[PDB]
Amino acid sequence: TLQSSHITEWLFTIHDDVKKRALECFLETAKVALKGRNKKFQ
Amino acid sequence: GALNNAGKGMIETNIGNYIQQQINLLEFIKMEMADVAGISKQREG
């Protein structure tokens, strides 16, 4: 089953890259939200 | 007397054997492509 997992690991690799970038985009969004007078972050 | 006998005729065409031949050829060609690429069936899964 590993050798078959190789066939789809490319889908999984691009998915993982997209997830990393989306989490960086979320982190910058949260950073900007910090300076918006929201008491949740406290 | 054949009009009260002789059974019922069939328009039969042997297209199943042709289909089997084509399927076998497809299996052979996919196998040969796998071999030349150096990627066996057992090595895909």
UniProtKB/Swiss-Prot annotation, chain A:
Compartment(s) of residence: Virion
Disulfide cysteine pairs (residue numbers): none
Source taxon at top rank: Viruses
Lineage: Viruses, Duplodnaviria, Heunggongvirae, Uroviricota, Caudoviricetes
Organism: Bacteroides phage crAss001 (Bacteroides phage PhiCrAss001)
UniProt subunit comment: Homododecamer. Interacts with the Cargo protein 1. Interacts with the major capsid protein.
Chain's role: Forms the portal vertex of the capsid. Probably involved in head assembly, genome packaging, tail attachment, and genome ejection.
The protein, known as: Portal protein
